[PDB]
Structures are given as structure tokens and as C-alpha cells.
Design a protein around this ligand. Structure first.
Ligand SMILES: O=P(O)(O)OC[C@H]1O[C@@H](O)[C@H](O)[C@@H](O)[C@@H]1O
Ligand SMILES: O=P(O)(O)OC[C@H]1O[C@@H](O)[C@H](O)[C@@H](O)[C@@H]1O
Lengths: 478, 478
């Protein structure tokens, strides 16, 4: 009499240090790229400023003060019955500037305290090494991951973490959503993935590919080093999975979708297979893109392939071939996509396609034959607190439950290997794309708004007990 | 000044023994499954009879008498400048019944003669071991490839061929279009792939999966013995690649297409990766399909993976989720497919989709990262001989040229590894599905009709000199 998922399935929740910790200067922590991004809103991009300026609002400085509240917050995770908790180690807490000879003890101690607290309640940490929060010093001084020197800085950081937590953290990922930067047209991904600040005349695409290359090399070096430190460590990649569907069976739409997926997921090919697909080299040739790519890089990549694929899933896309002057079937994320008329969308226009998660799980399995870990899934929405003092987020329950149903079908009917599932922003935190508190994801409401006002009190939403019962039934009761 | 295709590109043409040789009783040849299939036409199935019956017309018995005319025909291939020539070794010429302890010398000598003739002109043989022509005795005595005993019979046959031709044939494939039988609803594929004759009450699908399993094991064992005889032999699989497009971006259509591709191409996963995808095991478990599948089989499959993927391409398909009562997203090739509203079609209703060949080349490359060989592509059409004594088959030139253009883009722009290209039915022969002469594919016209009359004289069509120029220009001039 067993359920459809394995008994040890890793139910949990996921966050990122810069989005919830606050304490942005505590323990000698350095300024991160998140610390120079102002608040925005749907339709209004966050301002990336040259340092911390007066007259600007930086929501990540204080966030929800998890740095101080974590013991109480972790109690809440335990009440829901989390089996794991995904977060990031703030690079700037360990290497404030990035190029220090020795790591920061106060930073390392904080994660000792945090991971110890999780383990007290039987909650396994899942750690992302780089999650959109590299030291700003690496940006101004070195040019971020456009600089081969930054590879060694990351590997140093990774090695320190692997060694410190080798007996406390079983699950690791190197670069959060490493493929986001493929959208090089907008500033968000390049600045966050990679510490790239563009100037007039820059070939944004060529520079993106160079930084992505250095990150893939850094990831591979880190994987090898982590396994040397402890061969039992599970070390994965992390890609944002937004399946791109052809609009119709017109062969042109079909090829557009195939070629768009190729360009957005070559990162996974490198992480998994250890070499670049040939279509990337051909593309670079047509665009006259030159990438500093050495024989040592080739060896590192081949020897540092990942144990599993971590991924985020929120939505799917649709592409067609309506665009003129596209003889090479290039993909422009900002131009070739169209709306899917068969699905609904969030208030931030993120398409709701739970069946796409089943598609995604099958796609990764068929392509790569590795274990998968859904390390983000969530529904960002405006919450209202009712007269009973609780947010009745039936909309969030509906979204999450629909996705859980599809992932269960992938395991039970399709045979995919799925390690676990960690809803994003399980406690309300500062959003990434827009920097809002109002775009809420949590099972736990936090009393703080986009003007920085509120008590910061935590309270369960309707979805809190719902998810508690999901975990307790191992997914049988949704 | 190099061409877009590599210099060593294997331009050629492809046929199958039973479709052109005739001489069906010569040299002690046994009755094959082809020898018990009567002629049909479009919309009229060939009759599969119990032995050779009086009053029935069997077009494969004489075909175009290539058994006697091969020296003159090979000379025409040489005039077109073929780099290679693909055909099959008739299983029934080597093992007339299938279960003989020793091979037939007259059969082996014929292929020595044929391959020698090719090599006199620098034409490299490409050999398919099983191409819809297994010994009919294996059907009646053992139940064809539904019987584990037939594995050893095939491997014996393969070993004999590898040894005899180890220094004459560089390129081999095991089972022609092994995946056709994914369509188990009609009699054709199960009979021709596997020697399956169904009776009332049979679980057609379960029986197919069993025969497919024994063939995949046989293929793996054949690869192993071939490489043991001569490790330089290139031994590939052969799948029919009909890409299955979703009709629309409806997530249900998307999932139907993904699952249909899984069911139609798991054969390739086994040939390439050396293990069955888990979605097959889950499907069998759900459907209560039991397969005789041993640990020795598992080891053989893992050890006997192929060097390259040979495939045929003629058309693409479209699927949708219209069929009711299909909650598990099963694939029925005869019910779930729909017409592509964006394409034209041949007079036998075969959809014309040259871009789908580019999709196909990318799909195999992304999934398997092996060299590919397009070993069939062609346009079957009615030909008229004009007053100048020549068929002006501009329609055939148009189809082949359109496909060549797409394959060149796959190599030049997408970086696929493509070994060569061999148009199907390069000399007019007896068709497979309908057993017609009138459904012509050739660069070379053969004067024989569907009543079996005519001189059997060979004459070039307009496409003959066209293809001669394609090869001479290595595809620069189409
Ligand atoms: O916060 P958003 O903009 O709504 O996006 C949700 C999350 O999904 C991913 O993009 C990131 O890994 C997270 O950092 C981000 O918060
Ligand atoms: O002869 P048909 O029915 O038109 O199909 C063309 C060819 O395509 C493939 O299905 C077979 O491998 C060949 O044997 C066959 O002849």
C-alpha cells in the first residue's frame, strides 16, 4: 500500500539569500548586485544603480529580516513538515569583495547556524552557490563573469563552502537559472546571472556567451572539487525551464520552437554531456562571436558534469515564424513569442500551464536521463488579509496543486526520476524581477509592504495547512 | 573553396533485395514474406496469403530482374557517379528456411558478385541485413520474431554476412525501419518487420512489443559479433523518421506529440543508449503487457549499441488530442493523427515537408549525438514517357532538391553530423506498401507495369542527369 511518489520524496520550500535575509551589512557582508537594485513593479523595470545611492529604495537591504528571524521561520517550515529547505549561501557573506585570500568567518558561521537549525527539525538543506547575488566589487573591479579571473574566485568560494558544510549539506547546485541570461536584450539577466554592466557599443550577445562560458567552466571545476571533498555530495545544475511550444503544426513554427529550445537549453547540454552542441559553434560563426575557450576549459567541462538537473518551472511559452527577415531561424525572446490561447495567466502575465511541467519532466528525462529536482514553482499574486486575520489564497492552492498533480503523473505514469519539489518563496519575500513585496508567493504571510512599512510579523495563509497536508499524505491529498 | 557538405559525403541510392531482384527461386532461394504478398494499389491493401497461392499475383517474384541485370544497372549508378549503393542481403538467399546449420553458397556468391561490381566503379556497398523479407518458413514454423529462437537465427545470418563481406562492406544496418510496427493496428508492419501473422483474440500490441524486443536484442548481438569480426565496420540502426508535430500549442496536443514520439522512437533509445526508457516499462506495467526480457537481454542491449543512426524520411505527421477516452495519452497511429493543413501531398497522400527533414536531423542530433545517414528519401509518382523517350520528372527533381536543401542547412547551419544521402528506389522497383510498379521513384525508368508486362528495359529520366550534377557538385548545384 504505497503512494505514487517515493517515501523519501524531498518536499520542501525554496528561497534565495538576498531576497529574504536582510542584514545586508551584518557580519562584514559585502555589497552584492542585489544591493544596488531598486524596487519596481509589473511593467516598470528595477533600476540598476552605480552603487548605493541616496534617494533610492533598495528593498533587499532589509528584506524580511530572516537573518534575525530564521529560528522562528524554520519552526514554521517544520510545522508544515518540510523534508528539505532550499536557499543560497550569500557569496558576499563569505567573500565580501570576492577576491579575498581568506573567507569571512562570521558569514560561514551564519550558515552553520542556519543549517544546524534546519537539521534539528529533520530538514535537509539544499544549497545554491550563486543566486543573483555576486559581490558588486567583482563587477566594478573585474567586470564580473566577463573576466576569466572570476572563475577562480567562484571556485574558491565553492571549495570553501563544500569543505565547511561537507557533512551538513547533501544537495548542491552551482548557478541559479544559468540560462536566464540568454535573454541578453534586457539588462536583468546579464547583471544578475553574471555581473555584466553594458556600455554603448557592446555586443551584448557576444559578451553574454563569454560570461556563460566562464560560468559553465566554473560550475564544472566546482563539481569535480566538491566530489573530491565528499564523493557523496549531490551536485546539480539549475536551469529555468520555460517550454517553448510551436504555435501550430506549420513546419516553420515547429523548427522555430526546436531551435529556440536549443538556444535556451544548450546550458543543460554542457552541464550534462560535458561538451557544447555543434549548433552553438555554428551560430557563433555566423554572428562573428569569438569566445575565449581553451583546451583546459574543454577538459574541465568534460570532467565536471552534474549529478542531477535542478530546475524552476512557472510557465510555458509559444513561438511562431511570423517574424520577417529571419532566414537563419534566430530566436528573439522579446519578438518571436505569442500568447497561448489555451491557457490562463497570472496578474504578472505568467502563463499558467501545469501540464507543461509534465512535458518539461519528460523532455529533460528523454534528453538527459538524470534525476530531476523541481527547485522552484509558485504563484505570485496580490494577497489580501481577511477579517479572520488570514489570507485566503485559494488561487495559490489551485495553482500549486495543479502542478503537483502533473508532476505525480510524470513519476507514476511516465517513469521520470524526481528527487523532490520545493515551492518558491515559501515565506513571503522580495521578488526578483520587480523587487516587490506585493507579488506574494508564500505559505507564510509577512507583514511588510512595498513602502517598507509593516511589523514584519509572520502568519500562516490558507495554503499553509493545505501544504502541510500535502506533505503528510506524500501527495495523495491535494 | 570548400563546399557546405564534407568532401567524403556518401551520395548514393537505395533499394531492397525483394523489391528489385526477382530470381525469387534462383540459387535455392527460399520463400520470403515478400513472396506471399499480392499486388495492391492506393487504398487497397496487399493480400498476405498463407503460402504462394494459385490465381494470385505476386509482384516480388520477378520484380525488375535485377538479379540478372545488375551489371548493367550498376553501370548506370556509376554513370550518375554514386559514392555508395544501399541494398539488402536477401535473408532467404543465405538461409532459405532460416534454421539451416550452414549458409547457402550460391546466395553468398551472388552478393560477392554484386558487391564486387559496385567496387569496380568505386561504389561503396551499404547493407541492410533485414529488409521486409524474412524467411516465410520462420513464420510458419516458429511464429517469426515472436519466438526467442529466431534471435539466434538472425545473429547466425548476420555473422555469416559480416565474415564473408568483412573486407567489402564498410556500412551495415540491422533491421530496416524497425519502428514501423509501432503501428500494430494494421497487418503490414507487424508482418514485414517481424513475421507476425495475427489471429482472432490476439493482443496485437503485446505481441508486437515482444517481437520488437527480440529484434532489439538480435540487433545488439549482431553489432557485437560484427565488430568482433572487424572492429572497423560501421554498424547502424535504421528507423523510419516521421516527425510527429502537435496540431497546436494546446498543452494537450503538445503532450500527445511528445508521448507519440516516445512510442514511435523508443527503438532508437534502445539502439543508441542501450536501455529501454522508463516510460516503456511503466506503459507495459499499466497495460499488463508481459515481455520475456532477461538479464542477459539487458546486458546484450547495453553492450550492442550502434555506431550511427540510419533513417528514412518521406513525410511528417500531425497529432492532436481529439480522441475521446484516452486519459493516459496512448498513441494510436491509425486514429490520433490528423492532416497538416500547411503542406501539399503526393498522389498516395504522403505529406510533402522538406523542412521536417531538418527537424529530424536536429532531433536525432540533440537526443543522441551520433552520426546520421539519410538512407531513404524519395517521391513516388506516376511517370509518363514523352516523345523523346524520356520521363520529364520535374516533380521528382523538385521534391528531392527541396530535401537536399534542408539537409544542407542542417549540416552547414546546425552542425549535424551527416554521413550521406541515398534516395530511395533510384531504379524503378516494386513498391512496399502497395506492391505497385506505377508508384515510381527512380532516376532510371523501367519498362514494366502492374500487370507484369513490358520489356524491362532501363532508360534515364530527366532526374538522372540532374542527380549526376548534384553529386558532381557535391550539392552546390541543385
Ligand atoms: O520573484 P519573481 O520575479 O516573481 O520570480 C520568481 C523566482 O523565480 C526565479 O526567476 C528566481 O530563481 C527567483 O529568484 C525568483 O524570485
Ligand atoms: O514503396 P513505398 O510503399 O512507396 O515506400 C517507400 C519505401 O519506404 C520504406 O518504407 C521502406 O523501407 C521501403 O521498403 C519502401 O519501398
Amino acid at each position: 500500500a504505497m503512494s505514487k511518489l517515493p517515501e523519501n520524496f524531498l518536499w520542501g520550500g525554496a528561497v534565495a539569500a538576498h531576497q529574504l535575509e536582510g542584514g545586508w551589512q551584518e557580519g562584514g557582508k559585502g555589497i552584492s548586485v542585489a544591493d544596488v537594485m531598486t524596487a519596481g513593479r509589473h511593467g516598470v523595470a528595477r533600476e540598476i544603480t552605480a552603487g548605493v545611492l541616496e534617494g533610492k529604495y533598495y528593498p533587499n537591504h532589509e528584506a524580511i529580516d530572516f537573518y534575525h528571524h530564521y529560528k522562528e521561520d524554520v519552526k514554521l517550515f517544520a510545522e508544515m513538515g518540510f523534508k528539505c529547505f532550499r536557499t543560497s549561501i550569500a557569496w558576499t557573506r563569505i567573500f565580501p569583495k570576492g577576491d579575498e585570500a581568506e573567507p569571512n568567518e562570521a558569514g560561514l558561521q551564519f550558515y552553520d547556524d542556519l543549517f544546524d537549525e534546519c537539521l534539528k527539525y529533520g530538514i535537509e538543506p539544499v544549497v545554491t552557490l550563486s543566486h543573483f547575488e555576486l559581490p558588486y566589487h567583482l563587477v566594478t573591479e573585474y567586470g564580473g563573469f566577463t573576466n576569466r579571473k572570476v572563475i577562480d574566485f567562484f571556485v574558491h568560494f565553492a571549495e570553501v563552502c563544500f569543505r565547511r558544510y561537507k557533512d551538513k549539506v547533501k544537495y548542491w547546485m552551482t548557478f541559479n537559472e544559468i540560462n536566464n541570461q540568454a535573454n541578453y536584450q534586457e539588462d536583468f539577466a546579464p547583471f544578475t546571472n553574471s555581473g555584466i554592466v553594458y556600455k554603448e557599443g557592446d555586443d551584448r550577445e557576444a559578451i553574454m556567451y563569454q560570461a556563460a562560458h566562464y560560468e559553465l567552466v566554473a560550475s564544472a571545476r566546482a563539481v569535480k572539487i566538491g566530489h573530491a571533498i565528499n564523493p557523496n555530495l549531490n551536485i546539480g545544475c539549475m536551469v529555468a525551464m520555460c517550454p517553448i511550444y510551436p504555435a501550430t503544426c506549420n513546419p516553420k513554427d515547429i523548427l522555430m520552437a526546436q531551435k529556440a529550445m536549443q538556444k535556451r537549453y544548450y546550458f543543460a547540454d554542457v552541464h550534462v554531456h560535458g561538451f557544447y552542441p555543434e549548433h552553438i559553434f555554428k551560430y557563433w560563426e555566423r554572428k562573428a562571436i569569438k569566445v575565449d575557450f581553451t583546451e583546459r576549459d574543454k577538459k574541465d567541462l568534460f570532467e565536471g558534469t552534474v549529478d542531477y538537473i535542478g530546475f524552476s518551472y512557472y510557465m510555458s511559452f509559444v513561438i511562431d515564424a511570423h517574424r520577417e527577415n529571419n532566414p537563419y531561424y534566430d530566436y528573439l525572446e522579446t519578438e518571436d513569442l505569442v500568447k497561448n490561447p489555451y491557457v490562463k495567466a497570472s496578474d504578472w502575465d505568467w502563463q499558467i500551464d501545469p501540464q507543461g511541467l509534465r512535458y518539461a519532466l519528460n523532455w529533460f528525462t528523454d534528453m538527459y536521463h538524470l534525476p530531476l529536482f523541481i527547485v522552484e514553482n509558485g504563484f505570485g499574486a496580490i494577497d489580501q488579509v481577511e477579517a479572520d486575520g488570514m489570507v485566503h489564497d485559494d488561487y495559490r492552492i489551485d495553482y500549486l496543486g495543479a502542478h503537483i498533480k502533473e508532476m505525480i503523473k510524470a513519476v507514476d505514469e511516465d517513469g521520470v526520476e524526481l528527487m523532490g519539489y520545493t515551492p518558491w518563496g515559501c515565506i513571503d519575500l522580495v521578488s526578483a524581477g520587480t523587487g516587490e513585496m506585493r507579488k506574494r508567493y508564500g505559505f507564510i504571510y509577512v507583514d511588510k509592504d512595498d513602502e517598507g512599512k509593516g511589523t514584519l510579523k509572520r502568519s500562516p495563509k490558507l495554503s499553509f495547512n493545505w501544504y502541510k497536508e500535502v506533505i503528510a499524505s506524500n501527495g495523495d491529498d491535494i
